[PDB]
Design a protein around this ligand. Structure first.
Ligand SMILES: CN(Cc1cnc2[nH+]c(N)nc(N)c2n1)c1ccc(C(=O)N[C@@H](CCC(=O)O)C(=O)O)cc1
Lengths: 114, 114, 114
């Protein structure tokens, strides 16, 4: 799985250990080994949410499977909780786009997962 | 709806007010209120189009519905027009990927829109 | 086609010629004219892969057609090879998401490719 957060929160406000916390929490949430979890945080972005430049985040979670109605509700609670606690971003200023990827459409290690 | 633009145009060439103009015009174009619109501009990027480093842009528009052939032609005219007028990017050096998101695959405020 | 690479490798470690090589090799691999190839490299990113912040890359290839099982395996060998040779990223620390875009869902030059 791959989780990306783009945010206008400044770099210095991203706490040490945030990438490792995201890795462990997403490994637990997706049921996949941490070795497969990729995380990417992009601070200092020029972005607005609802016309406002107060703290916000635009995010995506891609996974081969483990994506669906109830699962995505759970991921949204988990990830909004982490963004609120660690980055001080209100959950109503976060969007997360979820992508269920087919194995043939994910390259890795000179091939794909197909 | 969520609109992202990545461009090699420098930050100082992004005019004041641009995020608000994008918010307003996308609200009108999609039929969703400004409150739902997120916009994200990423200047100073290392990118080429057709092998050339002349000004260019790679963009995304994500929406739950309101995506389709005629609508996407209209969005492209609107958004290429804005990028040409405000960022001086030729419309033939812009790509915009459109994504019709399922409500269950969009998270916000601790849940999803399903 | 459009290829994006996000990496924690620093900007100074991206060699001169990288975007040009990606453009030429992707034109060759996809069979599309280089005039239609867009490339984008984003170094200096805060990211981790599998619990490690050693060099890694999260990438996307979007194309109208030219996407499929065998084609994506070939692209992954080509692109992981380039990332290893030029950026010193191990191929097992690379993810590439492939997207077969409908022509009506790609804006360009004030319209779509439909
Ligand atoms: C971002 N959204 C949530 C929201 C709801 N439905 C959607 N439905 C679709 N199809 N797409 C998106 N993006 C949607 N987003 C959003 C943002 C701000 C207010 C808002 O300012 N509400 C007023 C009025 C209260 C109310 O909405 O009941 C307020 O003062 O809080 C509502 C919704």
């Amino acid at each position: 799985p791959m989780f990306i957060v783009n945010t206008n929160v400044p770099r210095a406000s991203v706490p040490d250990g945030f990438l490792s916390e995201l890795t462990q929490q997403l490994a637990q949430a997706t049921g996949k080994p941490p070795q497969y979890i990729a995380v990417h945080v992009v601070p200092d972005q020029l972005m607005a949410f609802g016309g406002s430049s107060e703290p916000c985040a635009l995010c995506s979670l891609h996974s081969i499977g483990k994506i669906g109605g109830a699962q995505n509700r759970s991921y949204s609670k988990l990830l909004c909780g982490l963004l609120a606690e660690r980055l001080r971003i209100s959950p109503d200023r976060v969007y997360i786009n979820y992508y269920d990827m087919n194995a043939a459409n994910v390259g890795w290690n000179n091939s794909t997962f197909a």
